[PDB]
């Protein structure tokens, strides 16, 4: 699902129209472009299934970042692909721990913003300082300027 | 591969693959042979409808549960139920999946040994493990201490656990459960004129009990109120019309839990066997058990039981201790959720009873180190 | 914005870290091999008298015994360190266990199967 | 007998890693072969010691990490 | 570098670096294996909780002290306690620190030799020295004469010292101490209905003894008063509620010190063994010993003992001598404070048993000049 989402991410915008057409083929009557609890429940009941609205709202909250509680077009695509689960085992804990232990050049048991900057410069991918700030926020929950082992695991949780 | 977390239970078989939130298929465990003659030819009439199919044709069947009180009394029917569960409700051949059955505490050995022998010879699973139904319910709550009262439909048992060390001398197993409450409700309904006798109508009385009955906070006040006003009389429509009105039978059926003298049982209610189970524990872990009392099992879903039980225990317990009763909304499937969590653990992956081990020591392997 | 780009950046970081770890490990292996080659005295198995040969062999045996004792001591020390760090790991689990058990994600029932059953082969994702 | 066991194991290692070595009855080819065996044994002991040093470094690093985690948790 | 002033004791291990005022880490010396089975998997359950950790999980452990009466009866457990003390309570590797253990007078030689052998072989300290527990308590008072009664928890010993010259023929060691008082209190509590049996409940009785008991100034008058009025009955709340009321058990438990016939011991009380220890000394230093009687050790912390003992000795002693009892408020840690002072001295810096000396003469070096 997420892998399929990434694969389709290299396609045109009309695939969203195709997915809307398929959803209409299922449960025609949708007009707003947002799949709330009622629409997903109805389509699964037609299929012979019933997703829990708690899971649906959890998906809405996880996909939301600004706190809007709604879905944009790309957010609609992410919500649609969230109906299935494919990210299994989150790669491997031991390899992630080894990479984190390699990250600590000073061997202080923590990763600061400077080490993050050095690792990003080593990567060399097209990135901006805003992405660095977002990654630091997603990693440093307590905002102590360091990364704990538990906090590093949470930042790498569900990451392949 | 993935493990099959089956949970035989007594009244509802709950099964599903390890690692999910809810059991995949939940269906009553009844096997009912037809009892009339049958005149249509070629209708494709089978000789035994099991599971949820026999709750729709129950008008011409004689349903009979294969599990009486935790123990299994009819092994052929139980084998049929397991075969149905594996092949039609999950559609996964057992040759490629470990299984994790569950068993009540203090059950006869022969039951457990026969269960493992069946699972290894007939269905031919790779490896199976049997776990006590209360430790799983403690897993699901995310605790590691606490005394869990797992009032199922067959048998109510009360296993105290501290810091992961179970106390085998403090398990109080009582055989009053949902089935006896159904029979008592069916027996007190006759005081208004409604007579249910057939084994099919026991299901109707069970539905009445589930939808209408509730546990009274104070019994005498409710008995006095229901005898003067009429604000309690709730009506219910039978499967054919002729609505019935339940008066003070509403809170008298589940009151049997706290006064087992109603159905002639000698023992004390579920409010006092928990306190006795606590008092058998050591003097230094009683505060933690008081604060982490856990409820589980289906029969603990009555509206208003988590308050009556707390009031009773607070009456019994010393005034200083804090009494807290954990009643998660997912009570019914708590045991199965805990089973899924336990089967999904990496540390547990080497505790299964591998088939070669069974071949070397026979069915009596279950009582050995692989518990 | 979307977490897809953030996920790509994180995966790129992980891949770069893995490549750097591989490079560092290979360099460490090479350095270790060179140091080990330097440590051991080269053999001189030519132009020696037979009695001198036996004397040199006995000297080598004595040095072998010395290195045996030294390596046994180092092995015992490392074993003690392993035991102590295992105890530390156990204490870490005790302070970080309890309710911190990860849970799998199976609450979603099979959706692709029903989609294909009720829609033929239109569901191209699964 | 734990310390006694350690001393016994050490003394055995004195005789286990190095068996009964009698170079008197060994000819020049045999002497060279046994000397090469001793040299290779010393080299292997050096390799094991180097690996032990690396493992000890890793153990110290992970111990520091665990101490940091313990301090942070409380 | 700095020296480690450890003090094994019996009941509380007190340790800390030399040159401070109070021990850094004080924790009971108990090692308790779990006794129940344990059903939770992956809970991280260890095989032995030592020190202060086993005073919190004592509900499911079987605590057992490794030191009975000064002597050490279980060497593996004592080694475990020392390892814990060095690595987790102080976090200083012993390879870089001298140690100064303490030992009761008149103890078996093998105990001391095994102690030094362990410290030199297992922990591999640079140098260790063993000192008598009473000389340190005399250091802490800042005196240089005086007869010190060090009533610990294991053994009560009474070492007289004059002008720095100890009198080896006048040491009176008596084996009644805090532990026997705990057992006697636990035995007389049964006269009201409270039964404590488990080795975990001995800790509760110890807490009762510490918080409530006191030494009566005059025994018969207190026995008469407690039998008529009710002004003495003090209540105490157990670890689970059910408060208890201690009557004349309050001053009867510590009275055993002055009348060891209560627990069946023949010898005379701590009020008369001090006078006997004085009378064995020479006739010209008895006045100084009378005037500088020192109290130490934990068990001498009972409220009102420094007056009862003075009254008793004044009754025994000649009427002209002045009897003074030194009872510093820091009684419990007096031995350790004295140990710190002794380890901080420059003149003492060459008395340590250096490791090369042990390698040359074996463990029997401790009885030699380096005492
Ligand atoms: N919502 C409910 N309210 C009251 N009673 C219920 C409810 N749901 C189930 N029960 C009772 O609980 C029983 C099911 O218990 P269950 O936990 O399935 O037993 P088991 O432990 O064998 O799985 C039913 O027989 C029914 O009598
Ligand atoms: N405040 C107190 N009041 C009465 N008794 C005490 C008090 N504190 C400690 N004790 C008794 O003294 C014992 C501790 O003695 P301690 O001096 O630690 O022995 P050690 O010489 O082995 O260190 C405890 O077992 C307790 O019974
Ligand atoms: Ca949004
Ligand atoms: Ca760093
Ligand atoms: Ca942080
Ligand atoms: Mg159950
Ligand atoms: Mg002492």
JSON list of N, CA and C in Angstrom, two decimals, chain A residues 28-69:
[
{"chain": "A", "resi": 28, "resn": "UNK", "atom": "N", "xyz": [-21.01, 4.88, -5.36]},
{"chain": "A", "resi": 28, "resn": "UNK", "atom": "CA", "xyz": [-21.35, 6.15, -6.00]},
{"chain": "A", "resi": 28, "resn": "UNK", "atom": "C", "xyz": [-22.32, 6.99, -5.18]},
{"chain": "A", "resi": 29, "resn": "UNK", "atom": "N", "xyz": [-21.98, 8.26, -5.00]},
{"chain": "A", "resi": 29, "resn": "UNK", "atom": "CA", "xyz": [-22.75, 9.16, -4.18]},
{"chain": "A", "resi": 29, "resn": "UNK", "atom": "C", "xyz": [-21.87, 10.12, -3.42]},
{"chain": "A", "resi": 30, "resn": "UNK", "atom": "N", "xyz": [-20.56, 9.89, -3.45]},
{"chain": "A", "resi": 30, "resn": "UNK", "atom": "CA", "xyz": [-19.62, 10.79, -2.82]},
{"chain": "A", "resi": 30, "resn": "UNK", "atom": "C", "xyz": [-19.44, 12.05, -3.65]},
{"chain": "A", "resi": 31, "resn": "UNK", "atom": "N", "xyz": [-19.33, 13.19, -2.97]},
{"chain": "A", "resi": 31, "resn": "UNK", "atom": "CA", "xyz": [-19.22, 14.48, -3.64]},
{"chain": "A", "resi": 31, "resn": "UNK", "atom": "C", "xyz": [-18.10, 15.37, -3.13]},
{"chain": "A", "resi": 32, "resn": "UNK", "atom": "N", "xyz": [-17.59, 15.16, -1.92]},
{"chain": "A", "resi": 32, "resn": "UNK", "atom": "CA", "xyz": [-16.60, 16.05, -1.33]},
{"chain": "A", "resi": 32, "resn": "UNK", "atom": "C", "xyz": [-15.17, 15.62, -1.55]},
{"chain": "A", "resi": 33, "resn": "UNK", "atom": "N", "xyz": [-14.93, 14.37, -1.93]},
{"chain": "A", "resi": 33, "resn": "UNK", "atom": "CA", "xyz": [-13.59, 13.87, -2.13]},
{"chain": "A", "resi": 33, "resn": "UNK", "atom": "C", "xyz": [-12.87, 13.43, -0.88]},
{"chain": "A", "resi": 34, "resn": "UNK", "atom": "N", "xyz": [-13.53, 13.47, 0.28]},
{"chain": "A", "resi": 34, "resn": "UNK", "atom": "CA", "xyz": [-12.94, 13.04, 1.53]},
{"chain": "A", "resi": 34, "resn": "UNK", "atom": "C", "xyz": [-13.68, 11.80, 2.03]},
{"chain": "A", "resi": 35, "resn": "UNK", "atom": "N", "xyz": [-12.93, 10.78, 2.40]},
{"chain": "A", "resi": 35, "resn": "UNK", "atom": "CA", "xyz": [-13.49, 9.51, 2.85]},
{"chain": "A", "resi": 35, "resn": "UNK", "atom": "C", "xyz": [-13.58, 9.56, 4.37]},
{"chain": "A", "resi": 36, "resn": "UNK", "atom": "N", "xyz": [-14.78, 9.83, 4.88]},
{"chain": "A", "resi": 36, "resn": "UNK", "atom": "CA", "xyz": [-15.02, 9.82, 6.32]},
{"chain": "A", "resi": 36, "resn": "UNK", "atom": "C", "xyz": [-15.33, 8.40, 6.76]},
{"chain": "A", "resi": 37, "resn": "UNK", "atom": "N", "xyz": [-15.80, 8.25, 8.00]},
{"chain": "A", "resi": 37, "resn": "UNK", "atom": "CA", "xyz": [-16.11, 6.92, 8.52]},
{"chain": "A", "resi": 37, "resn": "UNK", "atom": "C", "xyz": [-17.27, 6.28, 7.76]},
{"chain": "A", "resi": 38, "resn": "UNK", "atom": "N", "xyz": [-18.29, 7.07, 7.43]},
{"chain": "A", "resi": 38, "resn": "UNK", "atom": "CA", "xyz": [-19.50, 6.51, 6.82]},
{"chain": "A", "resi": 38, "resn": "UNK", "atom": "C", "xyz": [-19.21, 5.91, 5.45]},
{"chain": "A", "resi": 39, "resn": "UNK", "atom": "N", "xyz": [-18.43, 6.61, 4.62]},
{"chain": "A", "resi": 39, "resn": "UNK", "atom": "CA", "xyz": [-18.16, 6.12, 3.27]},
{"chain": "A", "resi": 39, "resn": "UNK", "atom": "C", "xyz": [-17.35, 4.83, 3.29]},
{"chain": "A", "resi": 40, "resn": "UNK", "atom": "N", "xyz": [-16.27, 4.81, 4.09]},
{"chain": "A", "resi": 40, "resn": "UNK", "atom": "CA", "xyz": [-15.45, 3.61, 4.18]},
{"chain": "A", "resi": 40, "resn": "UNK", "atom": "C", "xyz": [-16.24, 2.45, 4.77]},
{"chain": "A", "resi": 41, "resn": "UNK", "atom": "N", "xyz": [-17.04, 2.72, 5.80]},
{"chain": "A", "resi": 41, "resn": "UNK", "atom": "CA", "xyz": [-17.89, 1.68, 6.35]},
{"chain": "A", "resi": 41, "resn": "UNK", "atom": "C", "xyz": [-18.86, 1.12, 5.33]},
{"chain": "A", "resi": 42, "resn": "UNK", "atom": "N", "xyz": [-19.50, 1.99, 4.56]},
{"chain": "A", "resi": 42, "resn": "UNK", "atom": "CA", "xyz": [-20.46, 1.54, 3.56]},
{"chain": "A", "resi": 42, "resn": "UNK", "atom": "C", "xyz": [-19.78, 0.71, 2.47]},
{"chain": "A", "resi": 43, "resn": "UNK", "atom": "N", "xyz": [-18.62, 1.15, 1.99]},
{"chain": "A", "resi": 43, "resn": "UNK", "atom": "CA", "xyz": [-17.96, 0.42, 0.92]},
{"chain": "A", "resi": 43, "resn": "UNK", "atom": "C", "xyz": [-17.46, -0.93, 1.41]},
{"chain": "A", "resi": 44, "resn": "UNK", "atom": "N", "xyz": [-16.97, -1.00, 2.66]},
{"chain": "A", "resi": 44, "resn": "UNK", "atom": "CA", "xyz": [-16.53, -2.28, 3.19]},
{"chain": "A", "resi": 44, "resn": "UNK", "atom": "C", "xyz": [-17.71, -3.20, 3.46]},
{"chain": "A", "resi": 45, "resn": "UNK", "atom": "N", "xyz": [-18.84, -2.65, 3.93]},
{"chain": "A", "resi": 45, "resn": "UNK", "atom": "CA", "xyz": [-20.04, -3.46, 4.12]},
{"chain": "A", "resi": 45, "resn": "UNK", "atom": "C", "xyz": [-20.52, -4.03, 2.80]},
{"chain": "A", "resi": 46, "resn": "UNK", "atom": "N", "xyz": [-20.47, -3.24, 1.73]},
{"chain": "A", "resi": 46, "resn": "UNK", "atom": "CA", "xyz": [-20.76, -3.77, 0.40]},
{"chain": "A", "resi": 46, "resn": "UNK", "atom": "C", "xyz": [-19.77, -4.87, 0.04]},
{"chain": "A", "resi": 47, "resn": "UNK", "atom": "N", "xyz": [-18.49, -4.67, 0.34]},
{"chain": "A", "resi": 47, "resn": "UNK", "atom": "CA", "xyz": [-17.51, -5.74, 0.19]},
{"chain": "A", "resi": 47, "resn": "UNK", "atom": "C", "xyz": [-17.76, -6.88, 1.17]},
{"chain": "A", "resi": 48, "resn": "UNK", "atom": "N", "xyz": [-18.34, -6.57, 2.33]},
{"chain": "A", "resi": 48, "resn": "UNK", "atom": "CA", "xyz": [-18.53, -7.57, 3.37]},
{"chain": "A", "resi": 48, "resn": "UNK", "atom": "C", "xyz": [-17.52, -7.42, 4.49]},
{"chain": "A", "resi": 49, "resn": "UNK", "atom": "N", "xyz": [-17.21, -6.17, 4.84]},
{"chain": "A", "resi": 49, "resn": "UNK", "atom": "CA", "xyz": [-16.22, -5.87, 5.86]},
{"chain": "A", "resi": 49, "resn": "UNK", "atom": "C", "xyz": [-16.69, -4.64, 6.63]},
{"chain": "A", "resi": 50, "resn": "UNK", "atom": "N", "xyz": [-15.98, -4.32, 7.70]},
{"chain": "A", "resi": 50, "resn": "UNK", "atom": "CA", "xyz": [-16.34, -3.17, 8.52]},
{"chain": "A", "resi": 50, "resn": "UNK", "atom": "C", "xyz": [-15.14, -2.65, 9.30]},
{"chain": "A", "resi": 51, "resn": "UNK", "atom": "N", "xyz": [-14.45, -1.63, 8.80]},
{"chain": "A", "resi": 51, "resn": "UNK", "atom": "CA", "xyz": [-13.34, -1.07, 9.55]},
{"chain": "A", "resi": 51, "resn": "UNK", "atom": "C", "xyz": [-13.84, -0.30, 10.76]},
{"chain": "A", "resi": 52, "resn": "UNK", "atom": "N", "xyz": [-13.10, -0.39, 11.85]},
{"chain": "A", "resi": 52, "resn": "UNK", "atom": "CA", "xyz": [-13.48, 0.34, 13.05]},
{"chain": "A", "resi": 52, "resn": "UNK", "atom": "C", "xyz": [-13.24, 1.83, 12.84]},
{"chain": "A", "resi": 53, "resn": "UNK", "atom": "N", "xyz": [-14.24, 2.68, 13.14]},
{"chain": "A", "resi": 53, "resn": "UNK", "atom": "CA", "xyz": [-14.03, 4.13, 12.99]},
{"chain": "A", "resi": 53, "resn": "UNK", "atom": "C", "xyz": [-12.89, 4.65, 13.85]},
{"chain": "A", "resi": 54, "resn": "UNK", "atom": "N", "xyz": [-12.56, 3.97, 14.94]},
{"chain": "A", "resi": 54, "resn": "UNK", "atom": "CA", "xyz": [-11.41, 4.36, 15.74]},
{"chain": "A", "resi": 54, "resn": "UNK", "atom": "C", "xyz": [-10.12, 4.26, 14.93]},
{"chain": "A", "resi": 55, "resn": "UNK", "atom": "N", "xyz": [-9.96, 3.17, 14.17]},
{"chain": "A", "resi": 55, "resn": "UNK", "atom": "CA", "xyz": [-8.80, 3.04, 13.30]},
{"chain": "A", "resi": 55, "resn": "UNK", "atom": "C", "xyz": [-8.80, 4.13, 12.22]},
{"chain": "A", "resi": 56, "resn": "UNK", "atom": "N", "xyz": [-9.98, 4.45, 11.68]},
{"chain": "A", "resi": 56, "resn": "UNK", "atom": "CA", "xyz": [-10.06, 5.48, 10.65]},
{"chain": "A", "resi": 56, "resn": "UNK", "atom": "C", "xyz": [-9.64, 6.84, 11.20]},
{"chain": "A", "resi": 57, "resn": "UNK", "atom": "N", "xyz": [-10.11, 7.19, 12.40]},
{"chain": "A", "resi": 57, "resn": "UNK", "atom": "CA", "xyz": [-9.72, 8.46, 12.99]},
{"chain": "A", "resi": 57, "resn": "UNK", "atom": "C", "xyz": [-8.26, 8.46, 13.42]},
{"chain": "A", "resi": 58, "resn": "UNK", "atom": "N", "xyz": [-7.74, 7.31, 13.83]},
{"chain": "A", "resi": 58, "resn": "UNK", "atom": "CA", "xyz": [-6.31, 7.21, 14.12]},
{"chain": "A", "resi": 58, "resn": "UNK", "atom": "C", "xyz": [-5.49, 7.46, 12.86]},
{"chain": "A", "resi": 59, "resn": "UNK", "atom": "N", "xyz": [-5.94, 6.92, 11.73]},
{"chain": "A", "resi": 59, "resn": "UNK", "atom": "CA", "xyz": [-5.28, 7.19, 10.45]},
{"chain": "A", "resi": 59, "resn": "UNK", "atom": "C", "xyz": [-5.36, 8.67, 10.10]},
{"chain": "A", "resi": 60, "resn": "UNK", "atom": "N", "xyz": [-6.53, 9.28, 10.31]},
{"chain": "A", "resi": 60, "resn": "UNK", "atom": "CA", "xyz": [-6.69, 10.71, 10.04]},
{"chain": "A", "resi": 60, "resn": "UNK", "atom": "C", "xyz": [-5.74, 11.53, 10.89]},
{"chain": "A", "resi": 61, "resn": "UNK", "atom": "N", "xyz": [-5.61, 11.19, 12.17]},
{"chain": "A", "resi": 61, "resn": "UNK", "atom": "CA", "xyz": [-4.73, 11.93, 13.06]},
{"chain": "A", "resi": 61, "resn": "UNK", "atom": "C", "xyz": [-3.26, 11.73, 12.68]},
{"chain": "A", "resi": 62, "resn": "UNK", "atom": "N", "xyz": [-2.86, 10.50, 12.37]},
{"chain": "A", "resi": 62, "resn": "UNK", "atom": "CA", "xyz": [-1.47, 10.24, 12.02]},
{"chain": "A", "resi": 62, "resn": "UNK", "atom": "C", "xyz": [-1.09, 10.94, 10.72]},
{"chain": "A", "resi": 63, "resn": "UNK", "atom": "N", "xyz": [-1.98, 10.91, 9.72]},
{"chain": "A", "resi": 63, "resn": "UNK", "atom": "CA", "xyz": [-1.69, 11.58, 8.46]},
{"chain": "A", "resi": 63, "resn": "UNK", "atom": "C", "xyz": [-1.75, 13.10, 8.58]},
{"chain": "A", "resi": 64, "resn": "UNK", "atom": "N", "xyz": [-2.39, 13.62, 9.62]},
{"chain": "A", "resi": 64, "resn": "UNK", "atom": "CA", "xyz": [-2.50, 15.06, 9.80]},
{"chain": "A", "resi": 64, "resn": "UNK", "atom": "C", "xyz": [-1.26, 15.60, 10.51]},
{"chain": "A", "resi": 65, "resn": "UNK", "atom": "N", "xyz": [-0.80, 16.77, 10.09]},
{"chain": "A", "resi": 65, "resn": "UNK", "atom": "CA", "xyz": [0.34, 17.44, 10.70]},
{"chain": "A", "resi": 65, "resn": "UNK", "atom": "C", "xyz": [0.02, 18.83, 11.22]},
{"chain": "A", "resi": 66, "resn": "UNK", "atom": "N", "xyz": [-0.79, 19.60, 10.49]},
{"chain": "A", "resi": 66, "resn": "UNK", "atom": "CA", "xyz": [-1.16, 20.94, 10.92]},
{"chain": "A", "resi": 66, "resn": "UNK", "atom": "C", "xyz": [-2.36, 20.94, 11.86]},
{"chain": "A", "resi": 67, "resn": "UNK", "atom": "N", "xyz": [-2.94, 19.78, 12.14]},
{"chain": "A", "resi": 67, "resn": "UNK", "atom": "CA", "xyz": [-4.11, 19.72, 13.00]},
{"chain": "A", "resi": 67, "resn": "UNK", "atom": "C", "xyz": [-5.42, 20.08, 12.34]},
{"chain": "A", "resi": 68, "resn": "UNK", "atom": "N", "xyz": [-5.48, 20.01, 11.01]},
{"chain": "A", "resi": 68, "resn": "UNK", "atom": "CA", "xyz": [-6.71, 20.35, 10.30]},
{"chain": "A", "resi": 68, "resn": "UNK", "atom": "C", "xyz": [-7.79, 19.28, 10.43]},
{"chain": "A", "resi": 69, "resn": "UNK", "atom": "N", "xyz": [-7.40, 18.01, 10.60]},
{"chain": "A", "resi": 69, "resn": "UNK", "atom": "CA", "xyz": [-8.35, 16.93, 10.68]},
{"chain": "A", "resi": 69, "resn": "UNK", "atom": "C", "xyz": [-8.99, 16.53, 9.38]}
]
